[PDB]
Amino acid sequence: LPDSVDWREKGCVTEVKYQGSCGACWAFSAVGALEAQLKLKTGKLVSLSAQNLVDCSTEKYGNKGCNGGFMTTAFQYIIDNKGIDSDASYPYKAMDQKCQYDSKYRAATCSKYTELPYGREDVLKEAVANKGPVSVGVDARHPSFFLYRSGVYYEPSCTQNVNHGVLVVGYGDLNGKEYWLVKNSWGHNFGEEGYIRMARNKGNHCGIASFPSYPEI
């Protein structure tokens, strides 16, 4: 496997989004993973509709819109629904709305998704190298996460219990300090232009590998 990966260099990662007052991190995590797959298939980078997931991937999928949801079952909705709309066509409003999916504005499909084994940072590495960005959960319930500005994030008080959905778009190191490159959905003013580098190979740190999945077009 490559020692370092960064899917932004391949034009597979869209601009960092801002979820605002809605608990839609799961939706941003899911669309971000599919956005990379859409680029890899079609050669076009298109932001996909997190709102579509918030409004439509609801109770049937165990999801609660702005009150939370699952990246896995969001993918299942995209499969079941035979599509997801573009963000441009179905824009994000940081609130629960009636489902307004329109297949005319379908920008991506999903045929399947793969869930990676709990805590296997080796398997996650392989997936990020060979498949694409991987939707993950993390423990972000420590002020150090919100306060993160730069460097490789290590928080001794982190648990492996996931409470925040983000997207692993690469991995690398600084002279042996290994990290996962994570795209957040708190806008570009969070961390390193909207990204956080999180400690890799330090015991499933902050649950980075607790809940990983990636879709396929």
Ligand SMILES: *CC(=O)[C@H](C/C=C/C)n1cc([C@@](C)(NC(=O)c2ccccc2)C(C)C)nn1
């Ligand atoms: C990060 C985010 O927007 C939130 C909640 C923010 C609270 C301040 N969020 C966390 C999640 C997770 C953990 N799923 C659930 O919490 C959930 C809740 C209800 C039904 C299903 C799932 C995912 C797994 C990251 N989703 N949104």
